[PDB]
Each structure stands twice: as structure tokens, then as C-alpha cells.
Amino acid sequence: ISAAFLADVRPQTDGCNGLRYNLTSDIIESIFRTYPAVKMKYAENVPHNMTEKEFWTRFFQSHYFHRDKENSNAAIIKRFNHHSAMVLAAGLRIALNLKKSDRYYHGPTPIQSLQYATSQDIINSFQSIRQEMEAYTPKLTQVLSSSAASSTITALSPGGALMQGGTQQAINQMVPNDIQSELKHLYVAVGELLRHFWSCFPVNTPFLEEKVVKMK
């Protein structure tokens, strides 16, 4: 509820002599909540003593709406205080320390086959490369060969070992659109039924057993 329920609400005057009152319930309910007097007058008059449109016209033309001289200043101040009081009244109604950090080092990955080498002879092999690449000369011809290139292309050739699969079948045309919609609807039904089924789970009371039997 806002205090602008009267200031913002104005008699809508159209281009040529049109009183578009547009008496929405939202404004009327706001006035009734803020001003129970308007509600009482409407209940005691509309539509017997006067019609609803007649009552609204009276309210527009009444001196209570057009409040606009010490008496006038006092009346304005008192009305503002009463309005504020009505608005206010209507407004009423953990430190953590890990233990096993290694679990993060080997998380959801299971134990790999980290096979270790043999005795210190691996060092000799480590020496071998250390001696093999110690005296190194760049090479160009030895990098690739025509046979190697042909084999690589054959592996990369479409339909090849690396080129697995390819074009597939248009299942969209194999399934009629009406059948597609019916399948979607049956899927929705099955999903709702299974959601009801698993909603009972986990079973802790006998009532869940009977409900699951009904669902089955």
C-alpha cells in the first residue's frame, strides 16, 4: 500500500470531453483499505441510495476530495495526519581442518597403472639418452618419409581407422511427427508416474508401500 493512491489517481480527461474514469478494482480496493469511510458509504448507499458511478461522481465533487484561511490550513494538516495514520495502520494488516589431503591428489580418479622401472640400470638408460642427445645434429630428411606420409593420410582418410563412423540416418523422417508428439506425451506421462513412484522412496512407513503398489 502506497500513499500515492489518491495523488497519482486522476480523473482521465480525453481529447474531446471524455471522463474515462476506468474504475479498476485495484484503486477501489486501495481506497477502501486506506479509507474505511468510503467503503462504509459504498456499502450503505450503492446501489440503493445511489449508483456506484453516482457515488464516485459525488466523491470527485465532494469537498473531502477537493480539500482546497487558518481553518483551511488546519483542515489540510489534519487530513494529512489522518491519511498518514491510515496508511500506517493499513501497513500492519565453523573452522575446519583437513586430515587426509592426499585424497585431493588422487580424487575421483581410481588407482592408475603407475608401473615403475627396474633397478639402477634405468639410470644407465637415463645415461644413454644423456649420452645419445649430448652430441645431436638437426635432421630434416629423416623426419618423414613418403611411405610414412601415405600411411598417415590413409589413417586420416575418410572412413579410415581414425575416421570412425560418418554420416548417419535421418531418424527424424523415420519417426512420424504425430508419432513424435505421442511419444513426447507418453514420456511426460511416464515421467510423472515415475516421479510419483520415486517420491515415496525411500520407504519408511507402510503407507508408502501401498502408494507404490498403486503406482505400479
Between 7 and 111, CB nearer to other proteins: 111
**Residue 138 near other proteins by CB under 8 A:** yes
Number of residues that bind other proteins (CB under 8 A): 78
Pair 55, 46: CB distance under 8 Å:
yes
Q: How far is the CB of 163 from other proteins (least distance, A)?
A: 6
Instruction: Output the smallest distance, CB 119 to other proteins, in A.
Output: 13
Window 155-214: residues binding other proteins (CB under 8 A): 156-158, 162-165, 168-169, 171-172, 175, 180-181, 183-184, 187-188, 191, 194-195, 198-199, 201
List, in order, residues 6 or more apart from 125 with CB less than 8 Å away.
none
Cβ-based nearer residue to other proteins, 72 or 154: 154
Burial class (CB in 10 A: 0-12, 13-18, 19+), 34: buried
Distance from C-alpha of 59 to C-alpha of 84, rounded to nearest angstrom: 20
Q: Which of 74, 50, 59, 69 is nearest to 28 (CA)?
A: 59
Alpha-carbon gap, residue 29 to 7, rounded angstroms = 16
Q: Which three cell numbers stand for residue 216?
A: 505400479
Other CB atoms within a 10 A radius of the CB of residue 35 amount to 19
Residue of the chain from 19, 40, 153, 203 that contacts other proteins (CB under 8 A): 153
Smallest gap, in angstroms, from Cβ of residue 71 to other proteins? 23
User: Nearest distance from residue 14's CB to other proteins, in Å?
Assistant: 22
Site for other proteins in 77-136 (CB under 8 A): 91-100, 102-112, 114-117, 122-130, 132-134, 136
Output the nine-digit C-alpha cell for 99. Answer: 586430515
Kindly state the smallest distance separating residue 11's Cβ from other proteins, in Å. Answer: 21
User: Whose Cβ is closer to other proteins: residue 182's or residue 210's?
Assistant: 182
